[PDB]
């Protein structure tokens, strides 16, 4: 395919997010590289406006699923790559249990040889001393399955999952993730049979980064049809 060929090797990634959570405004800039042959993402983000007003883990899902490794027998179900280089719009609502919600719109496209994910985030109705603005979340992440089905109505895909954020008191906070992806261009795209992506994440800190930051490593692989 045309889009698939853009991902045969490692491609650099730029991510830019403008966010407003409960009126608290911030901006985050991140860089890294993706390698869809391994299904691997490596990224580092800094908050350029000072201290991030929400926990870094809550934004992991928001910060380029075109880098998933799709097994050889499944390449015709990879909506993400098939919508490239035109790219896709990724709109999503993340509902935090007994707390506020995020609404996100991202455009993920190629600019030159670099894959860019440009995000807009609006967050509302958050408890000011909740687990989010209260920074009560442990700095870690678990493995999850992302459920994907086609959406012919939009020539796109509908995708859902539930994130499990570990709380510092031993409890867990569920963030119900609903996201929709639609191509911008007019070239044909594959709408896949139902399947899923197994995702694993590891967060860390660069000891030499004086700025509020996060280092994210992800492994993502498609499965679920045989």
């Amino acid at each position, epitope marked *: 395919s045309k889009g698939e060929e853009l991902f045969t090797g490692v491609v*650099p990634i*730029l991510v830019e997010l403008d966010g407003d959570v409960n009126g608290h405004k911030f901006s985050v800039s991140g860089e890294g590289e993706g390698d869809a042959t391994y299904g691997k993402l490596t990224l580092k983000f*800094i908050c*350029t406006t000072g201290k991030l007003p929400v926990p870094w883990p809550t934004l992991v899902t928001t910060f380029v699923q075109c880098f998933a490794r799709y097994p050889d027998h499944m390449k015709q179900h990879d909506f993400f790559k098939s919508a490239m280089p035109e790219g896709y719009v990724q709109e999503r609502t993340i509902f935090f249990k007994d707390d506020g919600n995020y609404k996100t719109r991202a455009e993920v496209k190629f600019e030159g040889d670099t894959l860019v994910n440009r995000i807009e985030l609006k967050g509302i109705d958050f408890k000011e001393d909740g687990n989010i603005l209260g920074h009560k979340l442990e700095y870690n992440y678990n493995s999850h399955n992302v459920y994907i089905m086609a959406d012919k109505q939009k020539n796109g895909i509908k995708v859902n999952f539930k994130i499990r954020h570990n709380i510092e008191d031993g409890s867990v906070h569920l963030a119900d993730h609903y996201q929709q992806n639609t191509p911008i261009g007019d070239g044909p795209v594959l709408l896949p049979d139902n399947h899923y992506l197994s995702t694993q994440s590891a967060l860390s800190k660069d000891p*030499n*980064e*004086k*700025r509020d930051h996060m280092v994210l490593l992800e492994f993502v692989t498609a499965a679920g049809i045989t």
Partner: nanobody
Amino acid sequence: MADVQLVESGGGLVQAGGSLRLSCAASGPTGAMAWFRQAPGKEREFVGGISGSETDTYYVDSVKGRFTVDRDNVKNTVYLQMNSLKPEDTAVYYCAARRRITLFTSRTDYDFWGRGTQVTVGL
């Protein structure tokens, strides 16, 4: 992508409380550009920089208010104006640049380095 050089000028000797300017010229276009410093026993640490977008500037707390970084995207140059110097600012200062725009502050995130120019506050 590589083979871009950084040429430092300025610095030198000054009396405590004075002012000195560092300047750095790049052989070609570059992204975020910053200055680091190296005390003789310690090993280089970030002092201040600006992103290639020039939308983000950052200074360490120990320098806030006294130093001013600015850049000329056309001449491919940057400068650091240092005012109200203190004894603890004595060090070898390095110009640094990277291919991409994000103003990271880790030494490891920078792909190009000047030779280092000594600034000594001490009269």
